[PDB]
């Protein structure tokens, strides 16, 4: 979800 979207975006 959005937390995961942020995890992916910042990788």
């Amino acid at each position, epitope marked *: *979800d*959005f*937390q995961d*979207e*942020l*995890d992916e*975006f*910042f990788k």
Partner: antibody
Framework: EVQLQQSGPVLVKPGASVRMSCKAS????????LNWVKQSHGKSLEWLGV????????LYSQTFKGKATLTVDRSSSTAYLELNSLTSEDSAVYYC????????????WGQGTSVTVSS | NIMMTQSPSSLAVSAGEKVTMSCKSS????????????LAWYQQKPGQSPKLLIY???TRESGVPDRFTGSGSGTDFTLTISSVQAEDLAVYFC????????FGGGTKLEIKR
């Protein structure tokens, strides 16, 4: 020293669009993510989304999806926020604010751009 | 989203007094991969942009005076100013960045003299 220089205040009519800029200096713009945050009054902050200046891609709050568009010009180390379909409720100061990585706070904020939407 | 609530809305103290202010999240802000609470505090002085004070709920940002300390876990967080200085008047905001970023409504610290 680190600086984020934002463009000046603007007046725009309802229904119009506006683009504002945020120029990074004293550091390399690629090393930090760049967030945009609206302040509508002194006791309010609302996040719009975040730009990766290296790639040029962005992640947007669902609130601002299709309303805001983030871009970057790396040759001038300048990030941009465009807002469309403006209403009186979009009048606010808009800040750009850098963030090193996922787990970091927003460690340096620009001085803000005041946008007034009015007839 | 995760809702952030701050209390009190404002408070006033004389220079030298200790103050505590509260930030409550509607759910956990703990990030599992690093076991950090993704919770930041900012200070916004009148006419200035916000300044980052604390991140990870309790880690002080470089240059931030020792008098500012963040604490808490779960959904209950606190900012303490151990000995308030006249220049500390500001609105203090909390911020969660676990999910789509949200901010508290601010606590306005005023000075008595």
């Amino acid at each position: 020293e680190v600086q984020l220089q934002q463009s000046g205040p603007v007046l725009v009519k309802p229904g119009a669009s506006v683009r504002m800029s945020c120029k990074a200096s004293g550091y390399t713009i690629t090393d930090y993510y760049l967030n945009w945050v609206k302040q509508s009054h002194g006791k309010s902050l609302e996040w719009l989304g975040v730009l990766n200046p290296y790639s040029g891609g962005s992640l947007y709050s669902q609130t601002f999806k299709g309303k805001a568009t983030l871009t970057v010009d790396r040759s001038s180390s300048t990030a941009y926020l465009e807002l469309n379909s403006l209403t009186s409720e979009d009048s606010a100061v808009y800040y750009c604010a850098r963030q090193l990585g996922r787990g970091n706070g927003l460690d340096y904020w620009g001085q803000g751009t005041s946008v007034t939407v009015s007839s | 989203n995760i809702m952030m609530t701050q209390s009190p809305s404002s408070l006033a103290v004389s220079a030298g007094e200790k103050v505590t202010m509260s930030c409550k999240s509607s759910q956990s802000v703990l990030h599992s991969s690093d076991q950090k609470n993704y919770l930041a505090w900012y200070q916004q002085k009148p006419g200035q942009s916000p300044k980052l004070l604390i991140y990870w709920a309790s880690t002080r940002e470089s240059g931030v005076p020792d008098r500012f300390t963040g604490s808490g876990s779960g959904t209950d967080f606190t900012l303490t100013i151990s000995s308030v200085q006249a220049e500390d008047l500001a609105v203090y905001f909390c911020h969660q960045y676990l999910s789509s970023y949200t901010f508290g409504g601010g606590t306005k610290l005023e000075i008595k003299r």
